[PDB]
Amino acid sequence: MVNPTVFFDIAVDGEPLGRVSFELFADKVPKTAENFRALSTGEKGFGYKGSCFHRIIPGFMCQGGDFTRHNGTGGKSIYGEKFEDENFILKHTGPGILSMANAGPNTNGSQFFICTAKTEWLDGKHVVFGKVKEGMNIVEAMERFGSRNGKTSKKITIADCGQLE
Numbered sequence: 001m002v003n004p005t006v007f008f009d010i011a012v013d014g015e016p017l018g019r020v021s022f023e024l025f026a027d028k029v030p031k032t033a034e035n036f037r038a039l040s041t042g043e044k045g046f047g048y049k050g051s052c053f054h055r056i057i058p059g060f061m062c063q064g065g066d067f068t069r070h071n072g073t074g075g076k077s078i079y080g081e082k083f084e085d086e087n088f089i090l091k092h093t094g095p096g097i098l099s100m101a102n103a104g105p106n107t108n109g110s111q112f113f114i115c116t117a118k119t120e121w122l123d124g125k126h127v128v129f130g131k132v133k134e135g136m137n138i139v140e141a142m143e144r145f146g147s148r149n150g151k152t153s154k155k156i157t158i159a160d161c162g163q164l165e
Helices: 030-041 136-144
Strands: 007-013 015-024 051-058 060-063 097-100 111-117 126-134 155-165
Touching: 007 030, 007 136, 015 030, 015 051, 015 136, 030 060, 030 136, 030 155, 051 155, 060 136, 126 136
Parallel strands: none
Antiparallel strands: 007 015, 007 155, 015 126, 051 060, 060 111, 097 111, 097 126
């Protein structure tokens, strides 16, 4: 049992910005990784496909997963409306980490953010469950189209996504 990999063809307002890829730490956070896997691949008939990045904060993070709301509250797991924080083994060690946005303890579901720095201020508050494998330079471009008030200077989206297992 190894970590699944995923891809996302990132699109800014529909213009292809490039493929990006991530690894999902099933090896430590199986619930979170599996929950996310299915949402990226779209195999639950919803999820990440088209569901954008809603808070892009340069050198902080790129939050997304607004697939049922549009304000940083969308998303629920494949098993149900929230699940627990699995653990805090994996920490916000630097940019290119990936962690579950939640509403506090045991309220994580389908929002994540790409850490675009060492988001150690979030250590103990969010489930790190992935990392950028590839297209880190596209995440760096995505941030140019962020702001800091999170509301982007351009709509950042996923044209397509799936697994690269």
